[PDB]
Write an enzyme that holds these catalytic residues in place. Structure first.
Site, PDB file in Angstrom:
ATOM      1  N   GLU B 288     -27.872  -0.595 -13.364  1.00 15.04           N
ATOM      2  CA  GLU B 288     -26.465  -0.695 -13.686  1.00 15.04           C
ATOM      3  C   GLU B 288     -26.427  -1.326 -15.062  1.00 15.04           C
ATOM      4  O   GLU B 288     -26.934  -2.441 -15.273  1.00 15.04           O
ATOM      5  CB  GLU B 288     -25.693  -1.547 -12.680  1.00 15.04           C
ATOM      6  CG  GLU B 288     -24.148  -1.459 -12.911  1.00 15.04           C
ATOM      7  CD  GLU B 288     -23.592  -2.672 -13.638  1.00 15.04           C
ATOM      8  OE1 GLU B 288     -23.300  -3.675 -12.939  1.00 15.04           O
ATOM      9  OE2 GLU B 288     -23.433  -2.631 -14.900  1.00 15.04           O
ATOM     10  N   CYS B 322     -19.409  -6.570 -17.141  1.00 12.17           N
ATOM     11  CA  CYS B 322     -19.575  -5.112 -17.183  1.00 12.17           C
ATOM     12  C   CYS B 322     -18.299  -4.334 -16.855  1.00 12.17           C
ATOM     13  O   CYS B 322     -18.163  -3.167 -17.260  1.00 12.17           O
ATOM     14  CB  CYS B 322     -20.724  -4.619 -16.276  1.00 12.17           C
ATOM     15  SG  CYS B 322     -20.947  -5.532 -14.691  1.00 12.17           S
TER      16      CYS B 322
END
Ligand code: NA
Ligand code: NA
Lengths: 516, 516
Positions: B288, B322
């Protein structure tokens, strides 16, 4: 949409006169068409090229079975453009609509089963029952993936609710990818690898194996008649690595679905791991890369039953299966009785032109023959040749059912995938050692155990580290839906074909919340 | 095993006197404990080293929160040996037993909630509510994966029956793997990335982010107290690439679970695609890799609601997420009303030492401060600076909430992940243009739309190509279970955390047939 519960397509055994008659009729039609030329299929049309590829009869290699067009990079780029254009709308089809398209394709394939079987006979040297199993499996993949795809339909994801919000998760297809198919199941695996991703909304560029370009084209005739929108499926026969490499390395290829040799699978996976210039995703690559599959027999087994299963497993389609028993591991008490039976059964196997329905047809090509004969030469230094081990007479690539005994577990012939009718017999002390020997290869695809001892069977269930394990039966011929097919270790990425899980590999998930 | 249905751990707001009192005491105790040393955790024991690593307070970097042991290759190898040894028996635990161990670990983490939150405040500069959300999410991962793992228990796979045979497909864990965790959620994501694999029978070597090693050690204290068997979880803080590179590239590492920057993620995925000398499998790598996340607002929206949600999304934890809104895309009719509201709200945000519970604490490190300030310099030459854009006074790493407007969609500050309190405002004609601009980055992690127009929301549902999309609310703080978390494109491999599908990634399937 509501259809009958999935059942496997019956494999024709040709025991009736009508069945035999129908096959002969199909064989005649197919050979009368040996002169046919099959173009590429791109963007919903057959597209020819200046250059061509020739497909030979491995039972009579001076006989051409058809010719096809030959794609290069330009046609690869054209197909990629068509696939992405198609994806834009194909992704938005209701799942029921896509699944119906597949069901139509299965019905058309079922109606052409004999023609397809007869093409496998002439083009890749399958005998009649091998041919029938291959086509039946292809039908199975389409029937199974059509139904399985509905299990993923909008919005499929089970999520925890939250007050004052709708929380909706759902799957979406990846995009356009490339399928690189094998020659040994060029209807079944060719079809499965294409229709699984396509069923859920992906689009596909398919590169058939060089040895099976004709039967690949005939599958595409089926796709065409079924009415897949232009660019959804594309057909790019090619020579050598040009087309496959161009697409595997392309920044705009979204996924790669591959079945074939470890050598090539390793390159594909390594390349998939790289960000090509301008690439905007992490590529998914699914690889199935062969096996060095063993059958263990202990002293409690039904030795006759074991010998039959070993012979079917080792020599079915000339041992040219990723699932083939290429190792026979026998405990002390099982060694003599089992080996004697295996030898007696194997020495009675017929070998000849595939259309005569011999026990073995030829290996698929001159290159396959060279590879198998070279391994036979290696085997003569490593073990004791006790049956076969030679080329048989005629221009067809006929190789005798071959058996080596007293093979050391770490011998090249006990470790390396030969992909021909060659069985290595390994003698071990007991069941524990049999498991150790079974496990000590880089691979983990299929395996089997013949034994009546429950404790040995259940031990193997836990510790014989292969993706598809069979007790007291052959280790080949995994059925769609019944036996999810795929391996461990260097047999690939464990993408289980003929299973619900397969389609998940070709989807990504979106999570959308609305706060009211 | 039967437990209550999953619910999310409530996030403390500290509105009650009881909660404030508990938190003040927790912060006092943690501060009183500054300077404590935490060893490595390998094979069930705390193992110290000669070299050490220092963890600083980003709000007052002269202060040493603690020190840890420092792992190199030798300790990495020792940990891998321990993890493979533990795997042999840990894989064989009933799933109910493994799940109960996670539940115990959750109960112990819940009892130390205030301490862990206080450790986050001091070590990574989270304000009180950011710290509480982080710890609560860690608790949620353990609770969720403990339950979810049971859905995969022997024999979980739905297969088609065959006459005369038992066909049994089931999942098995992969082996020993490495977790490389981020500094921005160093309890939540550190925990989730470890306990997911471990729940279903894998073993793990975990490398904490350098800036968050103390809180990582405290999580390991919980693991040790819970009673995970030796080797099952291992803790290897280290400086720079040595430990991570050594494990990622190792022939005997089975999988890699990574959360952090695109740069590092790309190298990990590439290396996982290679066969290391002697390696006997195809590595799995889950990454990720961040985002460049936008909120779209159109002229139909609730402008005050949008401005609140934008400020929370952009500046929560100093924009070091993020999931953070780093782009605000405003249609022409929304531009002035929304920007003016966002500016008024943002200029009122407090910035100061995290222990004071300001709206913004410091960025995490001197290097982070440098990078963010460098991007601010770049932005000054790309768009129009309209708020903040400077470091504040004090030794802590304090940066003012920053806003650039009239930002070109392809500007570096509109494309590259800055990971700090810097919002880029992009003015567009209409909703169609808003979606085009939203989609045109290499990323696809989070996004949001404020609109009252149903057609615009449902259009975004289909076309705003991000893994986690939110309507009329903040785009950060995805809840375990409720909002499966993970992205598309260069935001990574769409490994959805806090979802049933996450655990499937750490399993392979075996199919075992017995013909009776
Ligand atoms: Na051929
Ligand atoms: Na720190």
């Amino acid at each position: 949409m509501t259809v009958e519960p999935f059942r496997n397509e019956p494999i024709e055994t040709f025991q009736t006169e009508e069945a035999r008659r129908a096959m002969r009729e199909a064989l005649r039609r197919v050979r009368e068409e040996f002169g046919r030329h099959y173009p590429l299929y791109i963007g919903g049309e057959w597209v020819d090229t200046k250059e061509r590829m020739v497909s030979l009869n491995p039972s009579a290699p001076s006989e051409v079975v058809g010719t096809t067009a030959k794609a290069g990079k330009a046609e690869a780029e054209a197909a990629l453009e068509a696939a992405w254009k198609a994806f834009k709308t194909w992704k938005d089809w209701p799942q029921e609509d896509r699944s119906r398209l597949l069901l139509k394709a299965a019905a058309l394939m079922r109606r052409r089963k004999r023609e397809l079987e007869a093409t496998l006979v002439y083009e890749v040297g399958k005998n009649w029952v091998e041919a029938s199993a291959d086509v039946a499996e292809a039908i199975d993949f389409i029937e199974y993936y059509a139904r399985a795809a509905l299990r993923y339909r909008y919005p499929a994801v089970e999520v925890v609710p939250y007050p004052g919000e709708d929380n909706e998760s759902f799957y979406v297809p990846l995009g356009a990818g490339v399928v690189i198919a094998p020659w040994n199941f060029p209807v079944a695996i060719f079809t499965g690898m294409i229709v699984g991703p396509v069923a859920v909304g992906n689009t596909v560029i398919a590169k058939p194996a060089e040895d099976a370009v004709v039967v690949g084209a005939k599958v595409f005739e089926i796709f065409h008649e079924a009415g897949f929108p232009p660019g959804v499926v594309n057909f790019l026969p090619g020579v050598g690595e040009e087309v496959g490499a161009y697409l595997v390395e392309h920044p705009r290829i979204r996924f790669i679905n591959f079945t074939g040799s470890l050598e090539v699978g390793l390159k594909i996976y390594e390349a998939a791991g790289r960000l090509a210039p301008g690439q905007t995703w992490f590529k998914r690559a699914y690889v199935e890369t062969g096996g060095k599959d063993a059958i263990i027999v202990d002293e409690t087994a039904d030795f006759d039953l074991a010998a039959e299963g070993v012979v079917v497993s080792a020599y079915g389609f000339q041992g040219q299966k990723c699932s083939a028993a290429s190792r026979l591991i026998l405990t002390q008490g099982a060694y003599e009785p089992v080996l004697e039976r295996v030898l007696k059964r194997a020495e009675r196997l017929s070998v000849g032109p595939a259309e005569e329905n011999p026990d073995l047809g030829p290996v698929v090509s001159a290159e396959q023959e060279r590879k198998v004969l070279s391994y036979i030469e290696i085997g003569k230094n490593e073990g004791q040749l006790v049956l076969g081990g030679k080329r048989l007479e005629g221009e067809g690539y006929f190789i005798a059912p071959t058996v080596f005994t007293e093979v050391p577990p770490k011998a090249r012939i006990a470790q390396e995938e030969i992909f021909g009718p060659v069985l290595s017999v390994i003698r071990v002390k007991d069941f524990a050692e049999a498991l150790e020997v079974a496990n000590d290869t880089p691979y983990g695809l299929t395996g089997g155990v013949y034994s009546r001892k429950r404790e040995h069977l259940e031990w193997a269930r836990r510790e014989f580290h292969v993706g598809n394990l069979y007790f007291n039966r052959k280790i080949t011929g995994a059925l769609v839906g019944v036996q999810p097919f795929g391996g461990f270790k260097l047999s690939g990425t464990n993408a289980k074909t003929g299973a619900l899980d397969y389609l998940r590999l070709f989807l990504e998930m979106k999570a959308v919340a609305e706060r009211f």
